[PDB]
RNA sequence: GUAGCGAAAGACGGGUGAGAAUCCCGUCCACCGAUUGACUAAGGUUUCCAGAGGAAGGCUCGUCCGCUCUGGGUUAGUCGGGUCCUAAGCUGAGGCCGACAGGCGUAGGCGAUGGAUAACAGGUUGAUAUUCCUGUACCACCUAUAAUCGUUUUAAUCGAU
RNA sequence: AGCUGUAAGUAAGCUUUGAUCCAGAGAUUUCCGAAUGGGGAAACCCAGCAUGAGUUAUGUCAUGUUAUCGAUAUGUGAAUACAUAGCAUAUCAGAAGGCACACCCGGAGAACUGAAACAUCUUAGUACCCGGAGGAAGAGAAAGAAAAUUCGAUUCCCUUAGUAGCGGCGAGCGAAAUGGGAAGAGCCCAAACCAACAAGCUUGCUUGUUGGGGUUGUAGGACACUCUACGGAGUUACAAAGGACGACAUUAGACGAAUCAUCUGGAAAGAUGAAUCAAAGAAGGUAAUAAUCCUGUAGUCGAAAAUGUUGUCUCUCUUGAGUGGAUCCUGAGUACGACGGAGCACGUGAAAUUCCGUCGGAAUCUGGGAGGACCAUCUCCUAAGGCUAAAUACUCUCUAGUGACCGAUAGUGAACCAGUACCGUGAGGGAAAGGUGAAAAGCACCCCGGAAGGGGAGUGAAAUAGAACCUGAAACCGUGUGCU
């Protein structure tokens, strides 16, 4: 899945970011309310948010590198 | 160390201090001349005031 | 050593001589499972998509060990070895050549 | 932030008497105060709230099989929103 | 199968239940009554409320329970505390003394058991209420509102380290 | 090729596009705690400064920063004038705490006890406390040890030897040299002297700064005298190749020979019989006792952090300059002494030898110190300056292994829920508790019963193997009976 977000241009992350945490949100309500049947989608997502702050702070790295 | 016996006449010990001979003396230390404590030993021809 | 889809023989147990197919392995405890070999008869109460039923026979796990590849030349059992080809690896009888088992 | 101090709502027998009334119940964190629970609600759901009350509740002990413990300590808040409604079901 | 079962008025009917002197309801009777009453602190920390349960606990019994299981329950601008003040005391940069460790001490700081400090009636739940709802008020902060002081020294106001 | 911790599978899913996993590197890493923005009843409260988001604005939120000493660069400046104290900034992060206080070095320092009481003595410079550092520390190159015709800086082991000696000459304490061995390493300063630099001085001299030079005795160096340097080449101090540097252990890892049948069995590895491999007959599992069933073993092939730290390893090194020493230098409040004490095997005194405190206080190579008071002759050495590897000591740990060590009242306190239930205000003290079966196949169904329990049936080799589950002793509690 990482290949991808080498690809991502460094503000798609930041948007592909929070609409994962709406996703999130919205599971972890819909599953209070006994109504998900699912429950596997909210780990996965989980694991791509952190895919994609990884992919960030490296590239902060490089940037620092360079400078 | 500093720390000895006294003993009696029969030999008998008790645990005793050695002090030093230290007077308050004005001397000129790295920078202004301050007063502290220092031996008449050492001021004998070990320092200035 | 083996796989899923194999074709064995059993040396050891109540069952020995009889041939099968392997259909799962489970190697943290090296113990597969054949079919008809090794059957229990299981007691079984009402669970909550079924009606009570009576005993229930099916397999049972085996040992490793007690389970034997068949050389596909001779169907005779034997032991196995590995051979590299082009850097990936296979698996050899120890008696012949080649035995091919995908499922 | 604005996401993640929301966590769960809470459904009850008392809560439902109060979504009879504009009175909706959330679990919160337990280090964010009501301004910041006001602002999210209304950043999330686009209403308008009125007041924001809450609570701490303490650990509950509890036991099973020889291996007790303590549950978590929660927050909860309840919102009165002025006018608005949210989807819960 | 002994001593003991921890001061005290219970009786009957009806009910529930496999099972009732011991649980629920009702009538009568009796006891405390400057208290066996009602609040608030300290302390304890979910023992609180609904259902379910009788294996263990309950000095008998048990259909009951402060016991077990499941799930719930504590809402504050004004109540008590901190964002205020200090007392005794505790720490205390520099500083003094001291085998080491360390002890003492100045400004200062911390510290209520004291000082200062704005909300009352009614309604409502199984379990919270000056906290939720209604009504009527009060106390601070910020912003627009414009008739008043019109050097800004001074001036109501700003105003002291 | 399966996987979704120990702790199980449901539901959901993931996986040959290489998952779960096994090593290496990196990112993230809430709060407390030396805790360091202030405070504080640890894991909480309360702020400020500058940016940023939002807000009409505050409010709120986020990101960094804000401790004390110290080091490196600055100006500053009261009682009292420049100067510095002190104060105010910029940068850095140098320290704090926790050690494994087991080993090592210092400071401080007991008593019970033995002497058949007890005081000198002993226990003992032990225990405890405190501080330091470290992976080792300490010591260390003769002002020595010895009296041979001498010897090797230090440390360690065996002997010398329970000797010599000390001792209310009691209890008891107790060496050294010599010898045999492990490991083996001698290097640098100050001062003389010389050549420059600046100030006083008038460049004469002095002062101080830099650089050479030289640090040792049957006397070394400077001056006086005489002719040579990378030959050797050495990073364990004394300089260095920082080098192509040629298996970290070649370590995770991979390959890795050879068995069939019958009998009993619930099941064979056992018995019988016939075969095989062996650089592999170590070990453990598999339904019972397996060299040839599995994991493995011997052995072979192996890569990152790597190099074994090993072989010419670029630079750089040290190819010596010998005589007299006549003159100059060769470590000062030092050596040494008196008084009081301690440490040395030595009981404080003739203390010879070595250290602390208080008072005094020198010699300078025709010198000075030691050789168990002191004097002389002889022998040895040249203090008051420093650094130094090895052999040595210990193990909270790690890797690989071993045992005429324990086998659940044993062995760690702890095989399991352990420094946990529990006790105590607190410092602290501190348990008990392992075993179904090969396989969960863990008793469908019927009957009594409110249920617990059971009786059948059934699984199983076995159910007086049913989870209060291997074996199941005795005390103890019962029911039946023969004799009484």
Do not use: C
Not at chain 4, 42 to 47: A, G, L
């Amino acid at each position: 899945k990482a290949k991808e977000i080498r690809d991502l241009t460094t503000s798609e992350i930041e948007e592909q970011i929070k609409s994962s945490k709406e996703e999130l949100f919205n599971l972890r309500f819909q599953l209070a309310t006994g109504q998900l049947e699912e429950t596997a989608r909210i780990r996965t997502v989980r694991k791509t948010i952190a895919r994609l702050k990884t992919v960030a702070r490296e590239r902060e790295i490089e940037q620092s590198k360079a400078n | 160390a500093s720390t000895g016996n006294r003993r009696s006449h029969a030999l008998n010990s008790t645990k005793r201090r050695w002090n030093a001979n230290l007077q308050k003396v004005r001397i000129l230390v790295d920078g202004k001349p301050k007063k502290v404590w220092v031996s008449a030993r050492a001021l004998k021809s070990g320092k200035v005031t | 050593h083996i796989k899923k889809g194999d074709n064995v023989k059993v040396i050891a147990g109540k069952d020995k001589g009889k041939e099968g197919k392997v259909i799962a392995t489970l190697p943290k405890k090296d113990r597969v499972v054949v079919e008809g070999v090794n059957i229990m008869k299981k007691h079984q109460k009402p669970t909550q998509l079924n009606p009570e039923g009576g005993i229930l026979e099916t397999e049972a796990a085996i040992h490793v060990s007690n389970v034997q590849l068949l050389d596909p030349k001779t169907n005779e059992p034997t032991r196995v070895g590995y051979k590299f080809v082009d850097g990936k690896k296979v698996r050899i009888a120890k008696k012949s050549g080649e035995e091919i088992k995908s499922n | 932030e604005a996401r993640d101090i929301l966590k769960r709502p809470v459904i009850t027998e008392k809560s439902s008497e109060a979504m009879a009334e504009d009175k909706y119940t959330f679990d919160v964190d337990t280090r964010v105060n009501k301004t910041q629970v006001k602002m999210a609600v209304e950043e999330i759901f686009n209403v308008k709230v009125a007041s924001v009350n809450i609570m701490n509740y303490k650990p509950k002990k509890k036991r099973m099989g020889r291996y007790q413990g303590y549950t978590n300590k929660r927050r909860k808040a309840i919102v009165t929103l002025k006018e608005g409604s949210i989807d819960l079901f």
